[PDB]
Amino acid sequence: IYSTVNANPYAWPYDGSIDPAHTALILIDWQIDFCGPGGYVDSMGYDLSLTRSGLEPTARVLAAARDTGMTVIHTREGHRPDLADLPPNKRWRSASAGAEIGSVGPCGRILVRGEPGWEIVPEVAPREGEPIIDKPGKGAFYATDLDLLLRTRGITHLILTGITTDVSVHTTMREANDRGYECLILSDCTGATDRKHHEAALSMVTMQGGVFGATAHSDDLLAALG
Amino acid sequence: MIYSTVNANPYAWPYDGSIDPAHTALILIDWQIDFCGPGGYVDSMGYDLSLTRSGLEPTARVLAAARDTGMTVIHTREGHRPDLADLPPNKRWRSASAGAEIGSVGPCGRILVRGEPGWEIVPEVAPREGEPIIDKPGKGAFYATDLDLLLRTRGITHLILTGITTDVSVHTTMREANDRGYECLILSDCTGATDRKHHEAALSMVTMQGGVFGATAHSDDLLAALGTTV
Amino acid sequence: MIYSTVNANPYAWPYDGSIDPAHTALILIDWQIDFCGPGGYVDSMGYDLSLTRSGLEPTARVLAAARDTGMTVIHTREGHRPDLADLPPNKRWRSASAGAEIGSVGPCGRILVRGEPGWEIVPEVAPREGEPIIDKPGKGAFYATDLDLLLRTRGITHLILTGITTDVSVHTTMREANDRGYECLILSDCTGATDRKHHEAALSMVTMQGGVFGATAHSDDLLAALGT
Amino acid sequence: MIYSTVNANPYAWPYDGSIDPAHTALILIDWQIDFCGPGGYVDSMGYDLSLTRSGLEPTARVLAAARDTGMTVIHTREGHRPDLADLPPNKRWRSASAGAEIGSVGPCGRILVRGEPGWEIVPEVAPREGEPIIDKPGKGAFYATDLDLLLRTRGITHLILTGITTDVSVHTTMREANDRGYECLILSDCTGATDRKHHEAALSMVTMQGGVFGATAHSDDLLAALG
């Protein structure tokens, strides 16, 4: 059992200790489509250095979670190759931005399950015993079995890493928080298409006594786990 | 009977090129004393009520336009069962830390408890018969409610969002609806937050990647479209 | 106090070998005039109310035992918003075809509408403060409600089911809970149906494949385990 | 291109008076060796496979008719992630009690595990590209899946149900769909159960209260309505 994390705006978690038997690290969408050359985000013309800066810090947190025996869950955003799970508005916006879901680029069909751009990057590769969530939306709970995996393991606390801070990570945090999960978001293990959106996404969590949970740097988590 | 697109950011809304009132709902989120009035939850935490109240008059004019065109209208209230059976202990603990514990007695009764004066919808945007009210225990209006059943029964595909706050309840509801494939518009002058920088960032987040959560617009741009049949 | 297993079909319930009141809820499903009283929905369709009412007094004895042991108690009411925004058109059409249209005026007010006399919980099993009531628009108590939030907030893992009808609202709620991993017991003498053969078949369906939906028991065997 | 009602119990189905293939899906539930073939889960528990297999050839004729009319077709497989992360401990314990533990090795590989021979859809009703397959960890096809997203994206309002077993996976899926407002038909000769009395009672339960869960029909009456 571990102590609290020095976090914003309260010492996390609210109940005063971290139990690996009730805590999961979530790694959200570390895929070429969100952080690598030739994928979805690169094809739209965004700066990949903003999404990639969280990769090596995430690998150090993943190693700490594995050493403490906490649950580890990974997510991949993606669609059935027949696109039966693709809403027409999501498709139309991706075409408007110059990177249509299902269209072929340097890393295969954009955001399609089984394609090279959709795979988890090797810097944070999963291992046996770490379930992978395949989500068709931004939030990892909707149209998945994530809540069943968490409730079966008795998980009450989540530590969030991955990309992007303001889209998939924030949506997943908001979904978990409404169900009563106690959530921490790591500031140096997340990133966005705009630095001001990354910073605003983190400061939004801290209002009203910690409306969505708390924020911390990975250094503050690693100090609590040591 | 069908209306043109809205001049919106970052695309002319909606994506399918017209607004049909038979398939469109206006959502009014949490226009309650607890979020925008003296003596409630937000006031007791020490935030500036002028930031949350400025969207009330514009919302009333959009509500009038929705009623005139025969759109669906749905209202939401955040709040808890008086026995607090729907209150997660972390939500309760943070509200106490912020100096406004849910269920504690203040100037407007028990904070965020269903049936209390602070929890009522303010009269400037009072519901009418035929405009369902959602009682939500969380920030998103879909979780632990019948909202998705009400929308699917009426054949709703498109949502127009107003209410408070931009970055918490409104954004959570927009993200939930968007993942299910609803086409959503958020009105910039009919929403507000505890911090102006968070209000502005919440709107600009919508506009990335071709409109990742939908589009943004001023109520003037919506009212112009609702005076232009095609 | 922690209690031993219940003599149940097809295994001594529950699977994990003890009953902890801190993690167990008694659910009372739809004990309303619309399902078990004169002038309501079920009476207006022409079904025999003695089939649905026989479980009322046994349910009151189990409710007393649940309150004595400090277990969670949750009640359900099936019903609709007065504006009928939560009423699917197929559910409405079938209720009209059966001679008891939802929302139509009958001897106990508008049929299956929230706030109407026929919709109230009957006094034999009146709720107490601290026993949450679920308002469900469907047969299953989880769909379009906050039930799963109430159960997870209290740390509930085990459910004991009573109420009506065995084959419709009770079975649908049991199937929904079971898929989420809740461990469920259905009481044979505290439930009932519009047809006795459907009541008996609904109970036997639970018992297949090692207890596919949980187990069945008589209230006497639950009260024996609780030492009442 | 729009079809008339099916002669069904207890009303001519559907309630709105016609069948539009653009808004209708045929669901094939759990036609797997684990539920209907030698060496699988149901066989290892000692139940009579002739009761679950009798609906296979009628189902194949209905699948051919659905393909000809351009209806949506959706298939389901019950089963678990190979790491068993989606397996509740009560489900596991009961399967061991019944002598067929989920994840244990039997004649067709690991019982109810995704990717194993006993878990595959049997060839008589093999899926085709553009007929989505649901992998469900529970009895109801909606819980912990993307089924509701697939149906709402296609504009589906009406469901025709086939598969096994009548009283477990088929009934649970019918009850879940009905509460959301889907209009459902269950085919009596394209379903089956571990007990014939449970099959018959599961069909009769649908028919009460003016059709509380929908209606029942024979394949013959559906194929007559489709022409």
- Cα–Cα distance list, A169 to A11, A174, C126 (Å): 21, 9, 45
The rounded distance, in Å, linking the Cα atoms of B152 and B135 is 18
Query: What would the DSSP string read from start to end of A149-179?
Result: HHHHHT--EEEEEEE-IIIIIHHHHHHHHHH
Contacts of A148 in chain D (CB under 8 A): 86, 137, 143-144
Q: Where are the domains of chain B?
A: 1-230
- The label of the residue with tokens 């409600």 reads C145
Chains that touch C (3 or more CB pairs under 8 A): A, B, D
Q: B126: how many CB neighbours lie within 10 A of its CB?
A: 13
The rounded distance, in Å, linking the Cα atoms of D222 and D26 is 12
> A148 CA to chain D: closest CA distance, Å?
6
The rounded distance, in Å, linking the Cα atoms of C117 and C126 is 14
At residue C227, the 3 state secondary structure works out as coil
The rounded distance, in Å, linking the Cα atoms of C149 and A175 is 13
The resolution, in Å, is 1.7
D92 touches chain C (CB under 8 A): no
Start-to-end C-alpha separation, chain D: 10
For residue C157, give the nearest of C15, C61, C7, C30 by alpha carbon.
Answer: C15
Continuous segment of H or E residues that includes residue B151: helix B147-154
Is A178 in contact with B138 (Cβ distance < 8 A)? yes
Taking a contact as any Cβ pair under 8 Å apart, which residues of chain A between 101 and 130 contact chain B? Answer: none
C198 → closest Cβ in D16, D178, D204: D204
Q: Which two tokens stand for residue C71?
A: 């277990």
The rounded distance, in Å, linking the Cα atoms of D34 and D43 is 8
B153 → closest Cβ in D149, D153, D181: D181
Contacts of B180 in chain D (CB under 8 A): 149, 152
HEC states along B170-205? Answer: HHHHHHHHHHHCCEEEEEEEEEECCCHHHHHHHHHH
Q: Say if strands C158-164 and C24-29 run parallel, antiparallel, or are unpaired.
A: parallel
Torsion sign, CA atoms D171, D172, D173, D177:
positive
B25 CA to centre of own chain: 12
Q: B230: how many CB neighbours lie within 10 A of its CB?
A: 11
The rounded distance, in Å, linking the Cα atoms of D189 and D200 is 11
- The label of the residue with tokens 């979670």 reads A65
D94 touches chain B (CB under 8 A): no
